[PDB]
Coordinates of C-alpha atoms and ligand atoms in Angstrom, one line a residue:
Chain A
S1 CA 19.9 5.7 -15.5
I2 CA 22.8 8.1 -14.9
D3 CA 22.1 10.6 -12.1
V4 CA 19.3 10.1 -9.6
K5 CA 19.4 12.8 -7.0
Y6 CA 17.3 13.2 -3.8
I7 CA 17.9 16.4 -1.8
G8 CA 16.1 17.2 1.4
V9 CA 16.5 21.0 1.3
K10 CA 19.2 22.5 -0.9
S11 CA 21.2 21.5 -4.0
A12 CA 23.8 23.9 -5.2
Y13 CA 26.8 23.7 -7.5
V14 CA 28.3 26.9 -6.0
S15 CA 26.6 28.3 -2.8
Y16 CA 27.8 31.4 -1.1
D17 CA 25.3 31.3 1.8
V18 CA 24.9 34.0 4.5
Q19 CA 22.6 33.5 7.5
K20 CA 21.0 36.0 9.9
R21 CA 22.8 38.5 12.2
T22 CA 26.0 38.3 10.1
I23 CA 28.5 41.1 9.5
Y24 CA 29.6 40.5 5.9
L25 CA 32.5 42.9 5.5
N26 CA 35.6 42.9 3.3
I27 CA 35.1 39.9 1.1
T28 CA 36.9 39.4 -2.3
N29 CA 35.7 36.3 -4.1
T30 CA 37.1 35.0 -7.5
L31 CA 35.8 31.8 -9.1
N32 CA 36.4 30.1 -12.4
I33 CA 34.5 27.1 -13.5
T34 CA 35.2 25.0 -16.6
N35 CA 32.6 22.2 -16.6
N36 CA 32.2 19.8 -19.6
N37 CA 29.7 16.9 -19.7
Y38 CA 29.7 14.3 -22.4
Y39 CA 27.1 11.5 -22.3
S40 CA 26.7 8.6 -24.8
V41 CA 23.7 6.7 -23.5
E42 CA 21.6 4.1 -25.3
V43 CA 23.9 4.1 -28.3
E44 CA 23.0 0.9 -30.2
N45 CA 24.3 -0.6 -33.4
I46 CA 22.3 -3.6 -34.5
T47 CA 23.0 -5.0 -38.0
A48 CA 20.1 -7.5 -37.8
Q49 CA 17.5 -8.5 -35.3
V50 CA 14.8 -11.2 -35.8
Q51 CA 11.7 -12.1 -33.8
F52 CA 9.8 -15.2 -34.9
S53 CA 6.7 -16.8 -33.4
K54 CA 5.1 -19.7 -35.2
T55 CA 2.1 -21.9 -34.1
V56 CA 1.0 -24.9 -36.1
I57 CA -2.0 -27.2 -35.3
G58 CA -2.8 -30.2 -37.5
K59 CA -5.2 -33.1 -37.1
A60 CA -5.3 -32.3 -33.4
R61 CA -8.2 -32.9 -30.9
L62 CA -8.1 -30.4 -28.1
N63 CA -10.6 -30.3 -25.2
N64 CA -10.9 -28.5 -21.8
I65 CA -8.2 -26.1 -23.0
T66 CA -8.0 -23.2 -20.5
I67 CA -5.3 -20.5 -20.3
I68 CA -5.5 -17.8 -17.6
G69 CA -3.1 -14.9 -17.5
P70 CA -1.4 -13.3 -14.5
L71 CA -3.2 -11.2 -11.9
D72 CA -6.2 -13.5 -11.4
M73 CA -8.2 -12.1 -8.5
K74 CA -11.3 -14.1 -7.4
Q75 CA -13.5 -14.4 -4.3
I76 CA -12.1 -11.3 -2.5
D77 CA -14.1 -10.0 0.5
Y78 CA -13.3 -6.9 2.6
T79 CA -15.4 -6.3 5.7
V80 CA -15.1 -3.4 8.1
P81 CA -18.2 -3.0 10.3
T82 CA -18.0 0.1 12.5
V83 CA -20.5 0.4 15.3
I84 CA -20.3 3.2 17.8
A85 CA -22.8 3.6 20.7
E86 CA -23.0 6.6 23.0
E87 CA -24.1 6.7 26.7
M88 CA -23.8 10.2 28.2
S89 CA -20.2 10.6 26.9
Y90 CA -17.6 13.0 25.5
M91 CA -15.8 12.0 22.3
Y92 CA -13.0 14.2 20.9
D93 CA -11.8 12.7 17.6
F94 CA -9.2 15.1 16.2
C95 CA -7.5 12.9 13.5
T96 CA -8.8 9.4 12.9
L97 CA -8.9 7.4 9.7
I98 CA -10.2 4.1 8.3
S99 CA -8.5 3.2 5.0
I100 CA -8.8 0.2 2.8
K101 CA -7.2 -0.5 -0.7
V102 CA -5.2 2.8 -0.9
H103 CA -2.6 3.2 -3.5
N104 CA -0.3 6.2 -4.3
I105 CA 1.8 5.0 -7.3
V106 CA 1.0 1.8 -9.1
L107 CA 3.1 1.2 -12.2
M108 CA 2.7 -1.9 -14.4
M109 CA 5.4 -2.7 -17.0
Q110 CA 4.5 -5.4 -19.6
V111 CA 2.1 -7.6 -17.8
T112 CA 0.9 -10.0 -20.5
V113 CA 0.6 -13.8 -21.2
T114 CA 3.1 -14.3 -24.0
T115 CA 5.7 -11.7 -24.7
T116 CA 8.6 -11.3 -27.1
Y117 CA 10.5 -8.1 -26.1
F118 CA 13.7 -6.6 -27.3
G119 CA 15.0 -3.3 -26.0
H120 CA 15.4 -1.2 -22.8
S121 CA 12.9 -0.7 -19.9
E122 CA 13.4 1.9 -17.2
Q123 CA 11.2 2.6 -14.2
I124 CA 11.8 5.6 -11.8
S125 CA 9.5 6.2 -8.8
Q126 CA 11.0 8.5 -6.2
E127 CA 9.0 10.6 -3.8
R128 CA 8.4 11.7 -0.2
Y129 CA 5.6 10.2 1.9
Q130 CA 3.6 11.9 4.6
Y131 CA 0.5 9.8 5.3
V132 CA -0.4 11.3 8.7
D133 CA 0.2 14.8 10.0
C134 CA -2.2 15.4 12.8
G135 CA -1.6 18.4 15.0
Chain B
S1 CA 16.9 8.5 -18.1
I2 CA 19.8 10.9 -17.6
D3 CA 19.1 13.4 -14.8
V4 CA 16.3 12.9 -12.3
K5 CA 16.3 15.5 -9.6
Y6 CA 14.2 16.0 -6.4
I7 CA 14.9 19.1 -4.4
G8 CA 13.0 19.9 -1.2
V9 CA 13.4 23.7 -1.3
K10 CA 16.1 25.3 -3.5
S11 CA 18.1 24.2 -6.5
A12 CA 20.7 26.7 -7.8
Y13 CA 23.8 26.5 -10.1
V14 CA 25.2 29.6 -8.5
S15 CA 23.5 31.1 -5.4
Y16 CA 24.7 34.2 -3.6
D17 CA 22.1 34.1 -0.7
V18 CA 21.8 36.7 2.0
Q19 CA 19.5 36.2 5.0
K20 CA 17.8 38.7 7.4
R21 CA 19.6 41.2 9.7
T22 CA 22.8 41.0 7.6
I23 CA 25.3 43.8 7.1
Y24 CA 26.4 43.2 3.5
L25 CA 29.3 45.7 3.0
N26 CA 32.4 45.7 0.8
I27 CA 31.9 42.7 -1.4
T28 CA 33.7 42.2 -4.7
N29 CA 32.6 39.1 -6.6
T30 CA 34.0 37.8 -9.9
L31 CA 32.7 34.7 -11.5
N32 CA 33.4 33.0 -14.9
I33 CA 31.4 29.9 -16.0
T34 CA 32.1 27.9 -19.1
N35 CA 29.6 25.1 -19.2
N36 CA 29.2 22.7 -22.1
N37 CA 26.7 19.8 -22.2
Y38 CA 26.7 17.1 -24.9
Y39 CA 24.1 14.4 -24.9
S40 CA 23.8 11.5 -27.4
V41 CA 20.7 9.6 -26.1
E42 CA 18.7 6.9 -27.9
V43 CA 20.9 7.0 -31.0
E44 CA 20.1 3.8 -32.9
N45 CA 21.4 2.3 -36.1
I46 CA 19.4 -0.7 -37.2
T47 CA 20.1 -2.1 -40.6
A48 CA 17.2 -4.6 -40.5
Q49 CA 14.6 -5.6 -38.0
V50 CA 12.0 -8.3 -38.5
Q51 CA 8.9 -9.2 -36.5
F52 CA 7.0 -12.3 -37.7
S53 CA 3.9 -13.9 -36.2
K54 CA 2.2 -16.9 -38.0
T55 CA -0.7 -19.0 -36.9
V56 CA -1.8 -22.1 -38.9
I57 CA -4.8 -24.4 -38.2
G58 CA -5.6 -27.3 -40.4
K59 CA -7.9 -30.3 -40.0
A60 CA -8.1 -29.5 -36.3
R61 CA -10.9 -30.2 -33.8
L62 CA -10.9 -27.6 -31.0
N63 CA -13.4 -27.5 -28.1
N64 CA -13.7 -25.8 -24.7
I65 CA -11.0 -23.3 -25.9
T66 CA -10.9 -20.5 -23.4
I67 CA -8.2 -17.8 -23.1
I68 CA -8.3 -15.1 -20.5
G69 CA -6.0 -12.1 -20.3
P70 CA -4.3 -10.6 -17.3
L71 CA -6.1 -8.5 -14.6
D72 CA -9.1 -10.8 -14.2
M73 CA -11.2 -9.4 -11.3
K74 CA -14.2 -11.5 -10.2
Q75 CA -16.4 -11.8 -7.2
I76 CA -15.1 -8.7 -5.3
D77 CA -17.0 -7.4 -2.3
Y78 CA -16.3 -4.3 -0.2
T79 CA -18.4 -3.7 2.9
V80 CA -18.1 -0.9 5.4
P81 CA -21.2 -0.5 7.5
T82 CA -21.0 2.6 9.7
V83 CA -23.6 2.9 12.6
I84 CA -23.4 5.7 15.1
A85 CA -25.9 6.1 17.9
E86 CA -26.1 9.1 20.3
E87 CA -27.2 9.1 23.9
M88 CA -26.9 12.6 25.4
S89 CA -23.3 13.0 24.2
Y90 CA -20.8 15.5 22.8
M91 CA -18.9 14.5 19.6
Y92 CA -16.1 16.7 18.2
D93 CA -14.9 15.2 14.9
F94 CA -12.3 17.6 13.5
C95 CA -10.6 15.5 10.9
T96 CA -11.9 11.9 10.2
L97 CA -11.9 9.9 7.0
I98 CA -13.3 6.7 5.5
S99 CA -11.5 5.8 2.3
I100 CA -11.8 2.8 0.0
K101 CA -10.2 2.1 -3.4
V102 CA -8.2 5.4 -3.6
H103 CA -5.6 5.8 -6.3
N104 CA -3.3 8.8 -7.0
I105 CA -1.2 7.7 -9.9
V106 CA -2.0 4.5 -11.9
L107 CA 0.2 3.9 -14.9
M108 CA -0.3 0.8 -17.1
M109 CA 2.4 0.0 -19.7
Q110 CA 1.6 -2.6 -22.3
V111 CA -0.9 -4.9 -20.5
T112 CA -2.0 -7.3 -23.3
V113 CA -2.3 -11.0 -24.0
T114 CA 0.2 -11.5 -26.8
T115 CA 2.8 -8.9 -27.4
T116 CA 5.8 -8.5 -29.8
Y117 CA 7.6 -5.3 -28.8
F118 CA 10.8 -3.8 -30.0
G119 CA 12.1 -0.5 -28.6
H120 CA 12.4 1.7 -25.5
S121 CA 10.0 2.1 -22.6
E122 CA 10.4 4.7 -19.9
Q123 CA 8.2 5.4 -16.8
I124 CA 8.8 8.3 -14.5
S125 CA 6.5 8.9 -11.5
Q126 CA 8.0 11.2 -8.9
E127 CA 6.0 13.3 -6.4
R128 CA 5.4 14.4 -2.9
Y129 CA 2.6 12.9 -0.8
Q130 CA 0.6 14.5 2.0
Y131 CA -2.5 12.4 2.6
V132 CA -3.4 13.9 6.0
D133 CA -2.9 17.4 7.3
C134 CA -5.3 18.0 10.1
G135 CA -4.7 21.0 12.3
Chain C
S1 CA 22.9 3.0 -12.9
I2 CA 25.8 5.3 -12.4
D3 CA 25.1 7.9 -9.6
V4 CA 22.3 7.3 -7.0
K5 CA 22.4 10.0 -4.4
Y6 CA 20.3 10.5 -1.2
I7 CA 21.0 13.7 0.8
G8 CA 19.2 14.5 4.0
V9 CA 19.6 18.3 3.9
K10 CA 22.3 19.8 1.7
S11 CA 24.3 18.8 -1.4
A12 CA 26.9 21.2 -2.7
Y13 CA 29.9 20.9 -5.0
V14 CA 31.4 24.1 -3.5
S15 CA 29.7 25.5 -0.3
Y16 CA 30.9 28.7 1.4
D17 CA 28.4 28.6 4.3
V18 CA 28.1 31.2 7.0
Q19 CA 25.8 30.8 10.0
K20 CA 24.2 33.4 12.4
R21 CA 26.0 35.8 14.7
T22 CA 29.2 35.6 12.6
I23 CA 31.7 38.4 12.0
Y24 CA 32.8 37.8 8.4
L25 CA 35.7 40.2 7.9
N26 CA 38.8 40.2 5.7
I27 CA 38.2 37.1 3.5
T28 CA 40.0 36.6 0.2
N29 CA 38.9 33.5 -1.7
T30 CA 40.3 32.2 -5.0
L31 CA 38.9 29.0 -6.6
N32 CA 39.5 27.3 -9.9
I33 CA 37.5 24.3 -11.0
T34 CA 38.2 22.2 -14.1
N35 CA 35.7 19.4 -14.1
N36 CA 35.2 17.0 -17.0
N37 CA 32.7 14.1 -17.1
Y38 CA 32.7 11.4 -19.8
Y39 CA 30.1 8.7 -19.8
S40 CA 29.7 5.8 -22.2
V41 CA 26.6 3.9 -20.9
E42 CA 24.5 1.3 -22.7
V43 CA 26.8 1.3 -25.7
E44 CA 25.9 -1.9 -27.6
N45 CA 27.2 -3.4 -30.8
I46 CA 25.1 -6.5 -31.9
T47 CA 25.8 -7.8 -35.3
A48 CA 22.9 -10.3 -35.2
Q49 CA 20.3 -11.3 -32.6
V50 CA 17.6 -14.0 -33.1
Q51 CA 14.6 -14.9 -31.1
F52 CA 12.6 -18.0 -32.2
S53 CA 9.5 -19.5 -30.7
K54 CA 7.8 -22.5 -32.4
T55 CA 4.9 -24.6 -31.3
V56 CA 3.7 -27.6 -33.3
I57 CA 0.8 -29.9 -32.5
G58 CA 0.0 -32.9 -34.7
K59 CA -2.4 -35.9 -34.3
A60 CA -2.6 -35.1 -30.6
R61 CA -5.4 -35.6 -28.1
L62 CA -5.3 -33.1 -25.3
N63 CA -7.8 -32.9 -22.3
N64 CA -8.0 -31.2 -19.0
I65 CA -5.3 -28.8 -20.2
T66 CA -5.1 -25.9 -17.7
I67 CA -2.5 -23.2 -17.5
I68 CA -2.6 -20.5 -14.8
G69 CA -0.2 -17.5 -14.7
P70 CA 1.5 -16.0 -11.7
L71 CA -0.3 -13.9 -9.1
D72 CA -3.3 -16.1 -8.6
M73 CA -5.3 -14.7 -5.7
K74 CA -8.3 -16.7 -4.6
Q75 CA -10.5 -17.0 -1.5
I76 CA -9.2 -13.9 0.3
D77 CA -11.0 -12.6 3.3
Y78 CA -10.3 -9.5 5.4
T79 CA -12.4 -8.8 8.5
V80 CA -12.0 -6.0 10.9
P81 CA -15.1 -5.5 13.1
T82 CA -14.9 -2.4 15.3
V83 CA -17.4 -2.1 18.2
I84 CA -17.2 0.7 20.6
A85 CA -19.7 1.1 23.5
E86 CA -19.8 4.1 25.8
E87 CA -20.9 4.2 29.5
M88 CA -20.5 7.7 31.0
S89 CA -17.0 8.1 29.7
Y90 CA -14.4 10.5 28.2
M91 CA -12.6 9.5 25.0
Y92 CA -9.8 11.7 23.6
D93 CA -8.6 10.2 20.3
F94 CA -6.0 12.5 18.9
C95 CA -4.4 10.3 16.3
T96 CA -5.7 6.8 15.7
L97 CA -5.8 4.8 12.4
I98 CA -7.1 1.5 11.0
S99 CA -5.4 0.6 7.8
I100 CA -5.7 -2.4 5.5
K101 CA -4.2 -3.1 2.1
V102 CA -2.2 0.1 1.9
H103 CA 0.5 0.5 -0.8
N104 CA 2.7 3.5 -1.6
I105 CA 4.9 2.4 -4.6
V106 CA 4.0 -0.9 -6.4
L107 CA 6.1 -1.5 -9.5
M108 CA 5.6 -4.6 -11.7
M109 CA 8.3 -5.5 -14.3
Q110 CA 7.5 -8.1 -16.9
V111 CA 5.0 -10.4 -15.0
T112 CA 3.8 -12.7 -17.8
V113 CA 3.5 -16.5 -18.4
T114 CA 5.9 -17.0 -21.3
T115 CA 8.6 -14.4 -22.0
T116 CA 11.5 -14.1 -24.3
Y117 CA 13.4 -10.9 -23.4
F118 CA 16.6 -9.4 -24.6
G119 CA 17.9 -6.1 -23.3
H120 CA 18.3 -3.9 -20.2
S121 CA 15.9 -3.4 -17.3
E122 CA 16.4 -0.8 -14.5
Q123 CA 14.2 -0.1 -11.5
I124 CA 14.8 2.8 -9.1
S125 CA 12.5 3.5 -6.1
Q126 CA 14.1 5.8 -3.6
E127 CA 12.1 7.9 -1.2
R128 CA 11.5 9.0 2.4
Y129 CA 8.7 7.6 4.5
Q130 CA 6.7 9.2 7.3
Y131 CA 3.6 7.1 8.0
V132 CA 2.7 8.7 11.3
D133 CA 3.4 12.2 12.6
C134 CA 0.9 12.8 15.5
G135 CA 1.6 15.9 17.7
Ligands
NAG201 C1 38.0 46.8 3.3 O1 38.6 46.9 2.0 C2 39.0 48.3 1.7 C3 39.4 48.3 0.3 O2 38.6 47.4 -0.5 C4 40.1 48.7 2.7 O3 40.4 50.1 2.4 C5 39.6 48.6 4.1 O4 40.6 48.9 5.0 C6 39.0 47.2 4.4 N1 38.5 47.1 5.8 C7 37.5 47.9 6.2 C8 37.1 47.7 7.6 O5 36.9 48.8 5.5
NAG202 C1 40.1 30.7 -14.7 O1 40.0 32.1 -14.3 C2 41.2 32.5 -13.6 C3 40.9 34.0 -13.2 O2 40.0 34.0 -12.1 C4 42.4 32.4 -14.5 O3 43.6 32.8 -13.8 C5 42.6 31.0 -15.0 O4 43.6 30.9 -16.0 C6 41.3 30.5 -15.6 N1 41.4 29.1 -16.1 C7 41.0 28.7 -17.3 C8 41.1 27.2 -17.5 O5 40.4 29.5 -18.1
NAG203 C1 27.9 2.8 -33.8 O1 27.9 3.2 -35.2 C2 28.9 2.6 -36.1 C3 28.2 1.4 -36.7 O2 28.6 0.2 -36.2 C4 30.1 2.2 -35.3 O3 31.2 2.1 -36.2 C5 30.3 3.2 -34.2 O4 31.6 2.9 -33.6 C6 29.2 3.0 -33.1 N1 29.2 4.2 -32.3 C7 29.3 4.2 -31.0 C8 29.2 5.6 -30.3 O5 29.3 3.2 -30.4
NAG204 C1 -14.1 -30.8 -20.5 O1 -14.7 -31.5 -21.6 C2 -15.7 -32.4 -21.2 C3 -16.2 -33.1 -22.5 O2 -15.1 -33.6 -23.2 C4 -16.9 -31.7 -20.5 O3 -17.8 -32.6 -20.0 C5 -16.3 -30.9 -19.3 O4 -17.3 -30.1 -18.7 C6 -15.2 -30.0 -19.7 N1 -14.6 -29.3 -18.6 C7 -15.1 -28.2 -18.0 C8 -14.4 -27.6 -16.9 O5 -16.1 -27.7 -18.5
NAG205 C1 34.8 49.5 0.9 O1 35.4 49.7 -0.4 C2 35.8 51.1 -0.7 C3 36.2 51.1 -2.1 O2 35.4 50.3 -2.9 C4 36.9 51.5 0.3 O3 37.2 52.9 0.0 C5 36.4 51.4 1.7 O4 37.4 51.7 2.6 C6 35.8 50.0 2.0 N1 35.3 49.9 3.4 C7 34.3 50.7 3.8 C8 33.9 50.4 5.2 O5 33.7 51.5 3.1
NAG206 C1 37.1 33.6 -17.1 O1 37.0 34.9 -16.7 C2 38.1 35.4 -16.1 C3 37.8 36.8 -15.6 O2 36.9 36.9 -14.6 C4 39.4 35.3 -17.0 O3 40.5 35.7 -16.2 C5 39.5 33.9 -17.5 O4 40.6 33.8 -18.4 C6 38.2 33.4 -18.1 N1 38.3 32.0 -18.5 C7 37.9 31.6 -19.7 C8 38.1 30.1 -20.0 O5 37.4 32.4 -20.5
NAG207 C1 25.0 5.7 -36.4 O1 25.0 6.1 -37.8 C2 25.9 5.5 -38.7 C3 25.2 4.3 -39.4 O2 25.7 3.1 -38.9 C4 27.2 5.1 -37.9 O3 28.3 5.1 -38.8 C5 27.4 6.1 -36.8 O4 28.7 5.9 -36.2 C6 26.3 6.0 -35.8 N1 26.3 7.2 -35.0 C7 26.3 7.1 -33.6 C8 26.3 8.5 -32.9 O5 26.4 6.1 -33.0
NAG208 C1 -16.9 -28.1 -23.4 O1 -17.5 -28.8 -24.5 C2 -18.6 -29.7 -24.1 C3 -19.0 -30.4 -25.4 O2 -17.9 -30.9 -26.1 C4 -19.7 -29.0 -23.4 O3 -20.6 -29.9 -22.9 C5 -19.1 -28.2 -22.2 O4 -20.2 -27.4 -21.6 C6 -18.0 -27.3 -22.6 N1 -17.4 -26.6 -21.5 C7 -18.0 -25.5 -20.9 C8 -17.2 -24.9 -19.7 O5 -19.0 -25.0 -21.4
NAG209 C1 41.2 44.0 5.7 O1 41.8 44.2 4.4 C2 42.2 45.5 4.1 C3 42.6 45.5 2.7 O2 41.8 44.7 1.9 C4 43.3 45.9 5.1 O3 43.7 47.3 4.8 C5 42.8 45.8 6.5 O4 43.8 46.2 7.4 C6 42.3 44.4 6.8 N1 41.7 44.4 8.1 C7 40.7 45.2 8.6 C8 40.3 44.9 10.0 O5 40.2 46.0 7.9
NAG210 C1 43.2 27.9 -12.2 O1 43.1 29.2 -11.8 C2 44.3 29.7 -11.2 C3 44.0 31.1 -10.8 O2 43.1 31.2 -9.7 C4 45.5 29.6 -12.1 O3 46.7 30.0 -11.4 C5 45.7 28.1 -12.6 O4 46.7 28.1 -13.6 C6 44.4 27.7 -13.2 N1 44.5 26.3 -13.6 C7 44.0 25.9 -14.8 C8 44.2 24.4 -15.1 O5 43.5 26.6 -15.6
NAG211 C1 30.8 -0.1 -31.2 O1 30.8 0.3 -32.6 C2 31.7 -0.3 -33.5 C3 31.0 -1.5 -34.2 O2 31.5 -2.7 -33.6 C4 33.0 -0.7 -32.7 O3 34.1 -0.7 -33.6 C5 33.2 0.3 -31.6 O4 34.5 0.1 -31.0 C6 32.1 0.2 -30.6 N1 32.1 1.4 -29.8 C7 32.2 1.4 -28.4 C8 32.1 2.7 -27.7 O5 32.2 0.3 -27.8
NAG212 C1 -11.3 -33.4 -17.6 O1 -11.9 -34.1 -18.7 C2 -12.9 -35.0 -18.3 C3 -13.4 -35.7 -19.6 O2 -12.3 -36.3 -20.3 C4 -14.0 -34.3 -17.6 O3 -15.0 -35.3 -17.1 C5 -13.5 -33.5 -16.4 O4 -14.5 -32.8 -15.8 C6 -12.3 -32.6 -16.8 N1 -11.8 -31.9 -15.7 C7 -12.3 -30.8 -15.1 C8 -11.5 -30.3 -14.0 O5 -13.3 -30.3 -15.6

């Protein structure tokens, strides 16, 4: 990456800002900007690049061979009983939540078993979070 | 990436902003902008690139051979009983939720078993989140 | 990375800011800007690059062979019973939550079993968090 920017309200190269109840009188503004940007990113010179994978089996006796990749989820139990009993009562539930297995951004990058990788990998995940706003 | 920008309200190269109840009188503004942008991104010179995968089996005795890839989900149980009983009562539920297995953005990038990859991979996931807004 | 920026409110190269109840009279502003940016990022010169993986099996007797990758989740139990009983009462729940297994940003980068990797890997995850805002 080069320029990652997070701004809460206002981003401005040149900002002449005037707010309320302002007497803006007799202003003379002169501005010169000479901006140059030069970027040389991911410039690659490879004369040769080799990837080789070889598997040879000969006169072999293989048994019970078991290979399991990543992310092996087994025997998972989620239990949320919710019993509510009334007896001449007064319930005011304005903002209540029951949440299980909640995802916003889930990025997987090259989840495999056997990998031969050459190159560039970039991940950007920038945000703002407001899970609860209950007046 | 080069320029990732998050702005809450306002993004402006040049912003002459005037707010309410403002007496804007006798203003002389002069502005010169000379902006140049030069980008050389993902420029690649490869004279040669080789990917080779070879599998050879000869006079072999294979048994019980089991291969399982990634993301192996088995015996998964989700249970949310919800029992509500009234007895001369007053319930005011303005904003209530029961959520299970909720996703907003789910990106998978090259989830395999055997991979031979050459090149560039980029992932961008930028957002704003407001799960709950209950007046 | 080169420039990671987090700004709460305002980001400005040049900011002439005026607030409320201001008498802005007799201002003469002169500004010259000569900005040059030169970036040479990820410039690579590789004359040769070799990746080699070889597996040879001969006259071998293999048994009970078990290979398990990373992230092996087994026998997982989550239990949240919730029993509420009323007896001539007054409940005022304005903002209450029950949360299990909650994720906002989950990034996986090259989770495998056997990996041969050449290159660059970049991860950026910048945000603002507001889980609870209960008036
Ligand atoms: C504002 O500028 C003008 C000329 O541009 C000048 O004659 C005047 O005296 C200045 N002030 C006011 C209050 O007008
Ligand atoms: C920028 O503009 C001003 C006039 O506002 C001038 O005097 C100056 O020479 C300029 N600079 C360039 C580099 O052009
Ligand atoms: C890549 O291209 C040629 C080939 O090697 C090389 O002479 C040149 O200097 C390189 N360019 C950059 C911008 O690195
Ligand atoms: C492994 O192989 C033997 C026979 O050689 C077999 O009895 C056994 O059940 C195998 N293992 C599994 C886990 O099945
Ligand atoms: C505003 O500028 C004019 C000429 O552009 C000038 O005659 C005047 O005095 C200035 N001020 C007011 C209050 O008009
Ligand atoms: C920009 O414009 C101003 C006039 O507002 C001038 O004086 C200056 O020479 C200009 N600069 C360029 C580089 O053209
Ligand atoms: C890529 O193209 C040629 C071939 O190698 C090389 O001479 C040149 O310098 C390279 N260009 C850049 C922008 O890197
Ligand atoms: C493995 O092979 C044997 C016979 O060689 C067989 O009895 C057994 O059931 C196999 N394993 C599984 C898990 O089926
Ligand atoms: C403001 O500037 C003008 C000329 O630009 C000048 O005549 C005046 O006396 C200054 N002050 C006021 C209060 O106008
Ligand atoms: C910038 O502008 C001013 C006029 O405001 C001028 O005197 C100066 O020479 C300029 N500088 C350059 C480098 O252009
Ligand atoms: C990369 O390109 C050529 C090839 O080796 C080399 O002569 C040059 O100096 C390099 N360029 C940079 C910007 O490092
Ligand atoms: C390992 O192999 C033997 C036979 O050689 C078999 O009895 C046993 O069950 C195997 N192990 C497992 C965990 O299955």
